[PDB]
């Protein structure tokens, strides 16, 4: 009796939705990030007694991250020089250095500053960047010129994994979960909210993701559970295994005129030839794979687990690809994954050979190519491995077989936007109460 309609504003209730998100970061470097000016400082409050649903495979902000990264790369490559005039027929024999087979690069003609004069030049290229022309094998051509135009990366604009904070707009709240054993789906009984995510580093790599975060408990294995026929299984390490890489030779940059644009070739290689390579702590890798197998055979309880190297595909998936400095690597990982397990502290080091190439197809897409200018001198690099991008083979009939993959770049950032979720606040709500309004 005497219960009347009443309305409340500022109510704590929300509904899930999708919306635009803001780029945020610290003071901008290099005079992947383009958003200025901002100074974020997020604060996290535990929503006591709040049970909320989550899903990593369905949320939209991963797609926003993907589009933002692609657009930023496009804007970075927009002012840089196009390498169209280089498409002419190269005449190559390449017998100068001690090792001719390793690089196998050419001499070609180019129109100089005066458009009526053509000048002969020559430069060094890896034959991964060059494809033989039909007929006489001395003729050669750039790999991607018959499919697309190649843009040289601007040398001063050296983008890198700068951390990025993704800030919600007004009226939306980025939720978060820190349940110690959350597998990417189902409710979280331990929820919180923030303005801005942590600093996500837009790293690009294949067969495993590095410079990542680390889980709370032991190694976490994340997968889609609509069907056993999964595309990719993400494994997140709780204990980083350090990886080191180097390019010992001393390379010599050289400039070729194109107006004021200059094309940066590899003029000469200084120092005796040594193939690029990397190092891994053998005992750590052994223990990590053993722990991963022990965790993984919970899901698949009555079968052996065997690790074997990838099969087929481009260099981006047949080998571990990444970049350190202004160079790209492609390291043969066959020795690492060749293991098997029964169904029932840096003592030694593994070494893996590696190859580097300059003309990079834009990882997600073909028909648009990047050319990396050569980094002079010698390079060393160190990074922290933090997860594996596995993918299983079906139809094996009582023997599981997980082999590395992950050519699709989106899976990398679906692991680091793993916690978060965005909701829309519904501040207005009604209820019954005792009332009167004067008349």
């Amino acid at each position, epitope marked *: 009796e005497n219960l009347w309609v009443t309305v409340y504003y500022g109510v704590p209730v929300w509904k899930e939705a999708k919306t635009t998100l803001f780029c945020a970061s610290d003071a901008k470097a290099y005079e992947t990030h383009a958003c200025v000016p901002t100074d974020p400082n997020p604060q996290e409050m535990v929503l006591k007694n709040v049970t909320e649903n989550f899903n990593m*495979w*369905k949320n939209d902000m991963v797609d926003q991250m993907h589009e933002d990264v692609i657009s930023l790369w496009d804007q970075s490559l927009k002012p840089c020089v196009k390498l169209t005039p280089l498409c002419v027929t190269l005449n190559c024999t390449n017998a100068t250095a001690s090792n001719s087979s390793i690089i196998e690069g050419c001499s070609f003609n180019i129109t100089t500053e005066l458009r009526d004069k053509r000048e002969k030049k020559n430069a060094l290229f890896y034959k991964l960047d060059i494809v033989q022309l039909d007929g006489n094998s001395s003729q050669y051509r750039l790999i991607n010129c018959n*499919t697309s135009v190649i843009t040289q990366a601007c040398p001063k604009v050296s983008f890198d994994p700068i951390p990025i904070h993704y800030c919600a707009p007004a009226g939306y709240a980025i939720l978060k979960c820190n349940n110690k054993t959350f597998t990417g789906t189902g409710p979280c009984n331990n929820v919180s909210t923030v303005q801005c995510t942590h600093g996500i580093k837009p790293v690009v790599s294949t067969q495993l993701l590095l410079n990542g975060s680390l889980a709370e408990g032991e190694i976490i294995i994340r*997968s*889609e559970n*609509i*069907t056993k*026929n*999964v*595309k*990719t299984i993400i494994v997140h390490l709780n204990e980083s295994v350090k990886i080191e890489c180097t390019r010992p030779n001393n390379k010599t940059r050289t400039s070729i005129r194109i107006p004021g644009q200059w094309f940066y070739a590899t003029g000469q290689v200084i120092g005796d030839i040594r193939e690029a390579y990397c190092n891994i702590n053998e005992s750590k890798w052994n223990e990590t794979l053993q722990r991963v197998s022990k965790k993984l055979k919970e899901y698949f309880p009555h079968k052996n687990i065997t690790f074997q190297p*990838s*099969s*087929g*595909g*481009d260099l*981006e*998936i047949t080998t571990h690809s990444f970049n350190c400095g202004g160079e790209f690597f492609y390291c043969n990982t066959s020795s690492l994954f060749n293991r098997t397990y029964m169904a029932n502290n840096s003592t030694r080091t593994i070494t893996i050979h590696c190859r580097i190439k300059q003309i990079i197809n834009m990882w997600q*897409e*073909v*028909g648009r190519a990047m050319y990396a200018p050569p980094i002079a001198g010698n390079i060393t690099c160190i990074s922290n491995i933090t997860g594996l991008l596995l*993918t299983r*083979d*079906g*139809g*094996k*009939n009582n023997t599981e077989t997980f082999r590395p*993959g992950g*050519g*699709n770049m989106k899976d990398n950032w679906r692991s680091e936007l793993y916690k978060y979720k965005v909701v829309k606040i519904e501040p207005l709500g009604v209820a019954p109460t005792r009332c009167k309004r004067r008349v």
Partner: nanobody
Amino acid sequence: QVRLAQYGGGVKRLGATMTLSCVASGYTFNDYYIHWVRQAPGQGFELLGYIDPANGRPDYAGALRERLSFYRDKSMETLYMDLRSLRYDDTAMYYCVRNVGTAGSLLHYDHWG
């Protein structure tokens, strides 16, 4: 709209290598996995393997891993498969079929070639 044309066929001599082909058309080439199923006469359908068109990752049935080989050509939106050392019981009609792949899993074929 979408059409998966095919070429190659006829008679292939015993023990010789053979190479079919496929051509995509009215859809985004990277977003849909491709499979290769075959039907011998007097048998139900069976799957050989599937090839991811974007990165080119293949995967084969257990009994035919040595003989098969899948590869594509992104610029032409073309796919292939080679079956080395044909045996007599390879007599069959080989369909290429699209797959409706979700964000993290694979599901029913829709558009057969």
